[PDB]
Structures are given as C-alpha cells and as structure tokens.
C-alpha cells in the first residue's frame, strides 16, 4: 500500500505514521499525496471514529522538500489526488471526523500547520517549533496565518511567525497550540488513548460538534446558532440518542453504533 | 415568586441562585422558563446594573434534565416565554447588561455553556466541568460549539468537547473559561464584589462596551470600528460623562446615574 | 526630536519614544498627530523593516488629554500622510510594530499595545481600562481586540470594572508576550525587532497581510490567497537569496524584493 506512511488500526482509531525517517519526514511529492489519500480514505470509512497522526524516527517533520514539488507550487498545481483531502485543509474542505496530532523533536514550518489543522495536539517534552518560512524568503502558506493568531492570539502568533525564532513545548502549550505535554516518547500513546475516548462517544454527536464549530468560523455566529436546535432534533432521532439517554437514566455504560 | 430560583437584590446587583435541590439543579422546562423570565426582567429593570448567577447546594448544575425536555425538543417548541430571554443567548438576542456566573462543584453540559454565555466567570477551587453531551448521544447545543473554541482556542475546546472528559478549575482557568479561582465557598461573594465594582461604573459606558464588543463578533471589525467614535460622542452628551469628568478633576469617585 | 516624540533609527529599526513625561505621556492633539505622521512615514519608508514604540520617563502613557481634543471628537485627528496609530479607521500598518511598556499603561495605552504585533512589558507595568470609570467607554479598539486576544471573559473582567491588573495577568491573558526585568523592555523589543529585520521583508509583509485578511474578510478569503501569494514570493530576489543560503549553509542578506 503506502510507501511513505505507516498505517495501523486500533479498533475505531486510525493511526498514521509519517514514515521517511532517514529524511526526517520531510514532505516530498509522494508523502504529500499519500497523506492526502489516507485522510480522504479516513473521511469516507464509517468504521473509523478518530485518527492519530505522528512521525516515525527522531522528529515529527523537517517541513517541505521543495525540489520534490518545485514544479507543482510554481505552477499552482494541486497535490491532492482524487479522492484525497488536503491534509492542511485550506482549499475549502475540512475533515468531518476528529484528527489528533502527536509531536516530538523539531516541528518545522508545515509541521506547525499540520498541528494547527487538527483538533487535538499532544507533545512530548522534547518538542520544539519554528516557523522558518520568512527566514527562507517566503511565508507560512499552510494556514498558520489564519489559525495561529486565532489559537494563540495575534501577539503570541506574530512573535513566532515574524521572527522565525524557535519555541519549545512549554511555550506551545502556554499559547494554546499544544493541549498536553507528556514524557519523552509518550505522545503517540497519549494521543491514541484520547482518540479511544472520542471513539466511545456517539459519532454523530462528535460529527455535529465539529460541523457546527466549523460553520461558526466560516459563516459566523448567526449561521451556527440557526443550526443548533435543528441539529439536536435530528440527533434525538438517532438510535444513539435513545441508547445514550437510557444509559444515563439506568446509570449504565452506552455502546454507540453511529446511527 | 419563582419555584426553581432563589432571587435577591443587593442594591444595584441582582443575585440569582439555581435551586432544584432534589434534581441537582438540572434544568427542566420550569427552570429554563423561569431563568428566561428572570433575565428578561433584569434586562428591563434600569435599577439593576449587574447580575450574578450561581447554584444553591452542592453543585452549580447537573445540566439538562434530559426529559422533562427531550419530548418537547423532539417536536420543535421554543422554551423562551413571552417577556423572557434565552439565558444561553443563542437565538439572536443577548443581554444588554453584565452577567457574572459563580460556579462550584459539578458544572455539567449547559452549565459550561451558561458560563460561556456570561461576561465574567468565578470558580471556587472545587469546581469541575464536563461537556457530557456526546456521551449521551447528542452534542453541545447551547453555544459551546461557538464560544468554547473562541475562548480556549480550537484544540483546547475540542479536547473537552469531543471526549466528554472531566476537567478541573485549574484547567478551566488556564484555557480562559474561568477568570479567577478562589477558595472553597467564596465564589458567589467574589462574583458579587466584582458586580458591585461594575455597578459603580457608568452604566451607559458599560452597556456600550458590551454592545460594541458584540457587534464586532456579529458583523466584523469594520462594523464595530464604524460605531466607535459616534458612540463615544453620544456618551459625552450624557449626565454621567460630566459626572465622570468632575471626579477625574477632583480625584474622587463618581456617583453615576445611568444617563 | 519632533516635539512630543523622540525618534531614532537603529539600522532597519525605527524607535519611537513618547516624550511628554511632565504630562505623563498623555496624548494631546499634538502627540496624536505626531505619532500619526511618524507611523505614516514608517509605512512608506522601505528602509524600515520594524518599529518599536515606548514611553520616555516613568510610564508608558496616562491616556488621553481630553481637553486638548474635546472640540474635535465632540473631526479626524489623522493628518495628511498620517495613519491612526490605533488603526481603527479601515487602515493598518503593512509592517510590524512592537510596543514596549513599563509603569502605568492606561486607557489608550492598552489599545496601542492591542493594535501592535508584539508587546513586551517590564515587571513594573500595570494596566487599567479606566474609560467606564469616567463616564465613557473604550473607543480605540479594545472592544474588538481585547476579547479576541484574551477571550471574552478575561477581557470583560477588566473592561467592565476599570480595575487595575498587572504584567503577570496581562501576560496570562495574551496581551503581553514577554515580561522582562525592570527597564529591559525597550532593549528586548529592539532585539526582537532586529530579528524581524533580518527576515525577508516581503515574507514578513505577506504574513501580516494574509493574517489581517483572515480577520477582515474570513478564512476563505485568506485561504484563496495562500498559494498565489507564495507563488509571487517564489519569483522574488529574496526567495532566490533564501534558497541560495539554505543550499550553501550561509545566512542570507535579504533586499526586500
């Protein structure tokens, strides 16, 4: 199957490992396209309720392998095959289901932007971060300009985006990019445990949470507000709502089916 | 007056305690409507300058009383009575004057959303929080999908909303939901002290701060910007602007009248 | 000297001090107009890559000198070639602004810090949004930027009360990026400004422009520009000098084109 990704399944959870460790997981054309496919596959697989993305080897990613895609970015060509989804989710399409990102070592450029594109980010204590693009004559073009100021606040984001200075896990956690810092090497297992918790919850409710939250950002408060009660009405209609409410009333544990 | 609310007036500050002791202050139709009315009544009472909301007994609230309400949400009915305002303020109307929420013990589902709907949140050291809606087959439909990501950042919000995991006052404060943590039992008194500070300020100035801030969120930066100077010009016209000027010159505390 | 400002150039970095210490650096009509002109000049001077704004003497600013402007507000205070330093009239700086604060930062001072891109405080800095305490409200952008940066609750705790908060709280809630020992705020801001000035200027400008577009027009608007903008940058001399430095292990001297 995939040349540059290591893929496994742990029940309802997909675990995707960037797997070009000899090249520090730099995104070449192949890994760009494979990650797009893997995430597109994730999107349409109804057996999957959460996905965890991490990197094999010494660090999460060294960023873009420019030569590999010279070429495409110069011509404005897409590195999203049919039926992939841009992993950075900045072309008008986002994932309908949760993505968690587990980071360690250097997280450069596009790596920061991958973490910002996800829903939950876990770092081990070694993680460092650097938005190096302006140091190289360009700028962040994977969504940092949009998402970093929204998560960290404008000032905290610009301190790092304008300078290209390196910042560590403690700082990334302080300013909201990283949700939790764990001991060396535990980032992937911590992210899967959280993914499994997500997978024990009602999938259509999880999906509705992501959907309404995204609508608020894209169309505004009124647009999200207008959907709140109609969406809960539709969910009260699902098998899982009756399962979940009966479990609550019975002080028992619900086994959701995703309909 | 109210069956499920305990209401007191401390000068310019309204103090409202949730009070359904046999059901852990969970919101059924009755308490929903009564809170809606009490807040609509606060809105129109020009002798009131701030409102504090807390929970009687061992917790703030256990959230939504599944049904009671379930049946009536299935069928589309509005639980906001004539004269009332949706306390969660997600139907296109918001309070014109400040709301502070004082929490302690368990703050479940709608309780987190009440805190998010308010202007200032004070927790005692015992407060814990859980966005349990996805654990019950539904999702958060009281505004957490809009407000939690905006306050905490997307990742911090999704860590709790997608998992239904419990988090403590320390986390709640770290991520911006709780403004101050105080010792056990001191939440309501601290919230009232802050409300009384607000009630000492110029009521039209306080209202203008809220109004322009909401405009920015609802219509965008340009819409808010456009009103900045016309609004301050209208305030210079007030009795309170001249009272505030005289206090500035005399280095004394103004007794504002709200016009 | 202007009269109300002390201005100097430190290489690519413009350093502006508010200079009315006998009046607690209150903004009167003159300093409002001088700061507007200096920032307008910063904007069109292609030899400046960053600007640092601080206060001379004991504090950053005591706020507005109302008497000085009362007639005007009750008329624009931006002169020709000027830009509103608070950047709430539909126009913002294209290049970075850092604000270095110490001592009291009252009313419009909080809002200058909020209009900036990076804020450094020394340990003595305290903040008070006093406007509601005086019969009016914050009208220099705090109502927009304070809730966005700090979160609604953290912002309203201070905006609705007029209570004083300190550097540690301003840092906790996102307004201040770093707290430094007493008197080191300007030096630190300048050091960061110099780091900015070593990066590619059209990259720095693109970062600001696209981030502002996201705020003013929305995610789709900003997203649509991402690749067209990087494409244009790849055409620049500085992109070539950047690639030459990476592949040859050297440090680039960018030229801003």
UniProtKB/TrEMBL annotation, chains A, B:
Gene3D superfamilies, A to Z: 2-enoyl-CoA Hydratase, Chain A, domain 1 (3.90.226.10), Lyase 2-enoyl-coa Hydratase, Chain A, domain 2 (1.10.12.10)
Pfam family, one: ECH_1
Signal peptide residue numbers: none
GO molecular function, one term: catalytic activity
UniProt-listed InterPro entries: ClpP/crotonase-like_dom_sf, Enoyl-CoA_hydra/iso, Enoyl-CoA_hydra_C
Family: Belongs to the enoyl-CoA hydratase/isomerase family.
Protein name (record): Probable enoyl-CoA hydratase/isomerase
Organism lineage string: Bacteria, Bacillati, Actinomycetota, Actinomycetes, Mycobacteriales
From TrEMBL, chain C:
InterPro entries named in the record: ClpP/crotonase-like_dom_sf, Enoyl-CoA_hydra/iso, Enoyl-CoA_hydra_C
Protein name (database record): Probable enoyl-CoA hydratase/isomerase
Pfam families in UniProt: ECH_1 (PF00378)
GO molecular function: catalytic activity
Domain of life: Bacteria
Family from the record: Belongs to the enoyl-CoA hydratase/isomerase family.
Gene3D superfamilies: 2-enoyl-CoA Hydratase, Chain A, domain 1 (3.90.226.10), Lyase 2-enoyl-coa Hydratase, Chain A, domain 2 (1.10.12.10)
Annotated source species: Mycobacteroides abscessus (strain ATCC 19977 / DSM 44196 / CCUG 20993 / CIP 104536 / JCM 13569 / NCTC 13031 / TMC 1543 / L948)
């Amino acid at each position: 199957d995939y040349e540059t990704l290591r893929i496994r399944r742990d029940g309802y959870v997909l675990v995707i490992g960037l797997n070009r460790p000899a090249k520090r997981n730099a995104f070449d054309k192949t890994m760009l396209e494979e990650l797009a496919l893997a995430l597109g596959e994730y999107e349409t697989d109804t057996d999957l309720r959460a996905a965890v993305l991490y990197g094999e080897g010494p660090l999460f990613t060294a960023g873009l392998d420019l030569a590999s895609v010279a070429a495409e970015i110069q011509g404005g060509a897409s590195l999203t095959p049919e039926g992939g989804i841009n992993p950075w989710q900045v072309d008008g399409r986002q994932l309908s289901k949760p993505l968690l990102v587990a980071v360690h070592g250097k997280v450069l450029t596009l790596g920061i932007e991958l973490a910002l594109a996800a829903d939950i980010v876990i770092a081990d204590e070694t993680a460092t971060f650097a938005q190096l693009e302006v140091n190289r004559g360009i700028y962040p073009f994977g969504g940092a300009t949009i998402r970093f100021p929204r998560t960290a606040g404008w000032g905290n984001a610009m301190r790092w985006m304008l300078t290209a200075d390196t910042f560590d896990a403690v700082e990334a956690h302080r300013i909201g990019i990283v949700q939790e810092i764990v001991p060396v090497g535990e980032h992937v297992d911590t992210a899967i445990a959280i993914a499994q918790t997500i997978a024990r919850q009602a999938p259509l409710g999880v999906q509705a949470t992501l959907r309404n939250a995204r609508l608020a950002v894209r169309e505004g408060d009124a647009a999200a507000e207008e959907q709140l009660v109609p969406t809960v009405r539709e969910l009260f209609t699902s098998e899982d709502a009756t399962l979940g409410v009966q479990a609550f009333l019975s002080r028992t544990t619900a086994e959701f089916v995703g309909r």
